[PDB]
Enzyme design. Structure first.
Site, mmCIF file in Angstrom:
data_model
loop_
_atom_site.group_PDB
_atom_site.id
_atom_site.type_symbol
_atom_site.label_atom_id
_atom_site.label_comp_id
_atom_site.label_asym_id
_atom_site.label_seq_id
_atom_site.Cartn_x
_atom_site.Cartn_y
_atom_site.Cartn_z
ATOM 1 N N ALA A 187 0.844 -1.190 0.000
ATOM 2 C CA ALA A 187 0.000 0.000 0.000
ATOM 3 C C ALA A 187 0.884 1.246 0.000
ATOM 4 C CB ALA A 187 -0.958 0.003 1.245
ATOM 5 N N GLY A 221 16.620 -4.366 -10.870
ATOM 6 C CA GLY A 221 18.007 -4.783 -10.703
ATOM 7 C C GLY A 221 18.856 -3.869 -9.842
ATOM 8 N N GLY A 222 19.918 -3.336 -10.451
ATOM 9 C CA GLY A 222 20.860 -2.515 -9.708
ATOM 10 C C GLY A 222 21.974 -3.468 -9.246
ATOM 11 N N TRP A 223 23.079 -2.912 -8.765
ATOM 12 C CA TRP A 223 24.217 -3.721 -8.351
ATOM 13 C C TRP A 223 23.905 -4.693 -7.227
ATOM 14 C CZ3 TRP A 223 28.964 -4.954 -10.043
ATOM 15 C CH2 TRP A 223 29.850 -5.572 -9.128
ATOM 16 N N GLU A 250 23.509 -5.929 -13.778
ATOM 17 C CA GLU A 250 24.926 -5.588 -13.808
ATOM 18 C C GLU A 250 25.828 -6.806 -13.523
ATOM 19 O OE1 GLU A 250 25.699 -2.059 -11.429
ATOM 20 O OE2 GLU A 250 23.784 -1.171 -11.973
ATOM 21 N N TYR A 251 26.073 -7.684 -14.508
ATOM 22 C CA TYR A 251 25.672 -7.555 -15.914
ATOM 23 C C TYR A 251 25.569 -8.971 -16.516
ATOM 24 C CZ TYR A 251 27.681 -2.963 -15.185
ATOM 25 O OH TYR A 251 27.963 -1.706 -14.650
ATOM 26 N N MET A 283 26.376 3.918 -17.644
ATOM 27 C CA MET A 283 26.767 4.272 -16.291
ATOM 28 C C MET A 283 28.206 4.751 -16.328
ATOM 29 S SD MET A 283 24.766 1.305 -14.105
ATOM 30 C CE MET A 283 25.095 -0.008 -15.200
ATOM 31 N N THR A 284 28.388 5.910 -16.952
ATOM 32 C CA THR A 284 29.712 6.503 -17.093
ATOM 33 C C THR A 284 30.127 7.294 -15.838
ATOM 34 O OG1 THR A 284 28.432 8.036 -18.522
ATOM 35 C CG2 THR A 284 30.016 6.580 -19.611
ATOM 36 N N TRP A 327 22.381 9.461 -11.433
ATOM 37 C CA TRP A 327 22.110 8.734 -10.190
ATOM 38 C C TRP A 327 22.608 9.675 -9.088
ATOM 39 C CZ3 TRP A 327 19.896 4.252 -8.527
ATOM 40 C CH2 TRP A 327 20.100 3.942 -7.170
#
Lengths: 498, 497
Positions: free
Chosen positions: B68, B94-96, B143-144, B211-212, B402
């Site tokens: 909720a 996802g994400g690391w 990743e990845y 993601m530089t 980010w």
């Protein structure tokens, strides 16, 4: 151990076959009568040269050939088998003149190997010609098939092999089966055309005769030995064309296999073949030249070696000027840039001003004419001691040479090769091979045995770490490696697991 | 003149969603109400993060989430669309933490893309979550995927694209179609995992968000800028992992495309993508960080840059020593190695001993604390001028960052990016891009335009000769060449007619 092959090409131009005589060296300089029973016993194979492939895509003699005269020359060679029950008189299809990319019959080679039907027709014709004239096997000498034509070429060799093997049973020739060989590139530039598929090319063959000569010549800007066994750091180096073959190897793999620049030597060609998986040393035959190549306009200081020169490099020789002192053969043949060993030896005994020198890295001799600024690269009985020892040490199948008619009248070069392999009174156990540069490339198909801890899933590896996994030892090329070896870019195959 | 994308991640941890409030920054530091209408108009996308892939191999919220509360937070983000009709609220999977090789949910990503059945099931779940919670698109942040998993990954993206295009028609969203993006590696090491199949990966996407950043950090022995635009010869260089990707290219081809070592920079990642055929500049989005990375134990001489250090690289931070002077957020989040731009701005003006310095080759700022031996690499409105000009010059799709919660309270970093792309009174025509090192690799996708005489069958060519054939310009690698480009390996394709 198994007897080393001694394969001598016997080349006779069409005009010499048509006017064949054994009593006039001005017409036929080297008739078959020069091969005595003693010389026949020194050979295991004579490759009669050359037949061709015609527009009907079948093996055939040059149409200008008088057929009866051709049969007669061939008969004189097959008569030699009476003196040596191991001798085979092979016939060679191709050669540079007929088969080079811009050659008079090149299209016929390309088209003959195209389809199952053309290959069958061509293979059947090779066997028909072999039986009709009395030959003992087939040597394919296409210089050289390239990339897109290689699969056809491979299939053609396989088909010829199938037909020859059936012919052997049909003719009850199990004691001396019909054989199949090819003349292969002895330098990386031409070798790169089909190198990736060497294993498939060599599988149908009894031998691959490497043309490990012509590694130097007037077409190159720096004088050099045309058949150096090992490299001389003082000599020129070359781009390693094998790095460009369609192999599918990584940058590291290509770099480790193909050092560049490198020394273009006999040892380099031999080792490049052995680097490939599925290419047995016993099928590799080392070619040697029975002729030398000459240059003019060379500077002093290093005996004419590694010098700029003023020698035209094109064919035919563009001038009427014959500057190779004492070379009457050069005048007759209208080219002062090449001379048989027979002629070079006579020049050395004619007090013409040449000094015979020796390079102890390359293990080859050379002539230098100080007064006229000439340099000649050639091979002799002495360089053959090193080449014969290399053939034994590397467990090669034997030696091939171009060509018989260029040996001296007594057949000393052929006698020397036979002596080094077979004479009870020749002992090369103490022959020092020197410190010349060896080719040290390592391919993913010839990795050394290595030892390392099994890879552990879930482990993070640092750069340079070594692990064993699925039959190989692998090394990381950077750090924080969390992936397993195999396909993944981070791991490099560096050795084999015992 | 297509508007540049401005993609900001909005990250909120589960405990914050469960205790969501917009009136207590000690509990939720950056609630949705901080994204005022003016800020909403400056974004084109907000990537809500992070959802995960569960054991059923379906897209799903962390199971500890109060649903909720989650819907309430998402509803607040989608309500922002009332202020900007081009705005999309994407959700990122996802994400690391969840998806790295050693992450808690890694096997789920690997297994979800394995078969036609698992891919169909996963793809259906992404669209279902999108429609159920009211999101506008899907952002995959694995990743990845590793080489062996790439074909599966590609098939999964294709299936999601097929379902999204179907959903767009069914929902009458032709004016604002549902979108699919991924967060792509911004450094060659991770990029080498799937680089060979970049064209196939990018085809189903609206954007690949590079993601530089994180190109430097405590896991590296030498302190360095984490998002240098261009290289500094005085800085460290790295092994070019791409030369080891399964490309099937020749030595010359690999060497020309992948110089090694090279400078690990934002420009390097962008150029590396452009070197592949089938990777349009318009789909490439440059990521930038709204946070800095800090190092302790640095030496002097170069303002803390390119120095050895004594900063632990492990996660979680393996100590309780919070040494980043002035960084209150670091104490709260228990890690002195990372700090938001918001916190860094306060540190810089608080007389804590930091000096702000500028590297004019990398076009990025850094802090140096001479008393304590600290170095901080971060980005600000000034480094963003060069990155935005680069995005424009290179015709890239836009910028991604980010994360939103790290901008200052006035939203200055976001406002700067928006100004650089859209303000009629901002003029960067005189902005000098500098002499920092550019990545100069050449691949099939960025061959220079050239002209050369047509190759002539029968002709022999010397080393260095140039010819046109099959629409490209070729050069010989050695001499006495007697067959044609494409049929003789002596020829190297060096140009485009």
């Amino acid at each position: 151990s198994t007897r080393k092959a001694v394969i001598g090409y016997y080349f006779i131009p069409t005009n010499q076959i048509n006017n064949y005589t054994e009593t006039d060296t001005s017409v036929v300089p080297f008739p078959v009568s020069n091969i005595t029973p003693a010389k026949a016993k020194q050979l295991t194979h004579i490759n009669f040269s050359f037949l061709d492939i015609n527009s009907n895509l079948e093996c055939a003699w040059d149409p200008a050939t008088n057929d009866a005269k051709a049969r007669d020359v061939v008969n004189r060679l097959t008569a030699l088998k009476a003196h040596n029950p191991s001798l085979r008189i092979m016939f060679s299809i191709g050669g540079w003149y007929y088969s080079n990319d811009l050659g008079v019959s090149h299209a016929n080679y390309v088209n003959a190997v195209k389809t199952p039907a053309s290959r069958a027709k061509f293979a059947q014709s090779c066997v028909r010609i072999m039986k009709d004239y009395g030959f003992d096997g087939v040597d394919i000498n296409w210089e050289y098939p390239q990339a897109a034509e290689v699969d056809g070429f491979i299939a053609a060799l396989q088909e010829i092999r199938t037909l020859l093997n059936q012919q052997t049973i049909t003719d009850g020739r199990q004691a001396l089966p019909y054989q199949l060989t090819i003349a292969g590139a002895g330098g990386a530039f031409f070798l790169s055309r089909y190198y990736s598929k060497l294993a498939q090319i060599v599988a149908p063959l009894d031998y691959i005769n490497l043309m490990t000569y012509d590694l130097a010549g007037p077409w190159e800007k720096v004088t050099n030995h045309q058949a150096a066994l090992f490299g001389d750091a003082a000599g020129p180096t070359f781009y390693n064309a094998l790095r460009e073959a369609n192999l599918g190897w990584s940058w590291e793999e290509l770099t480790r296999a193909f050092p560049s620049p490198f020394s273009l030597t006999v040892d380099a060609a031999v080792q490049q073949h052995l680097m490939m998986e599925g290419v047995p040393s016993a099928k590799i035959v080392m070619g040697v030249p029975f002729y030398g190549r000459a240059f003019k306009g060379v500077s002093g200081g290093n005996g004419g070696q590694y010098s700029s020169h003023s020698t035209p490099g094109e064919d035919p020789y563009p001038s009427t000027d014959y500057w190779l002192v004492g070379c009457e053969e050069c005048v007759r043949d209208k080219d002062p840039r090449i001379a048989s060993y027979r002629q070079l030896e006579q020049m050395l005994q004619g007090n013409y001003g040449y000094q015979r020198l020796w390079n102890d890295k390359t293990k080859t001799p050379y002539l230098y004419h100080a007064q006229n600024g000439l340099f000649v690269t050639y091979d002799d009985a002495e360089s053959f001691k090193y080449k014969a020892k290399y053939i034994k040490q590397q467990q090669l199948g034997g030696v091939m040479f171009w060509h018989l008619g260029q040996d001296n009248r007594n057949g000393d070069l052929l006698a020397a090769l036979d002596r080094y392999f077979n004479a009870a009174d020749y002992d090369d156990s103490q022959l020092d091979m020197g410190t010349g540069l060896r080719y040290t490339g390592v391919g993913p198909g010839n990795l050394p045995i290595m030892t390392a801890p099994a890879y552990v899933p879930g482990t993070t590896y640092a750069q340079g770490a070594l692990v064993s996994y699925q039959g190989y030892v692998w090394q990381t090329k950077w750090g924080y490696i969390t992936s397993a070896p195999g396909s993944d870019s981070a791991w490099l195959k560096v050795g084999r697991v015992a």
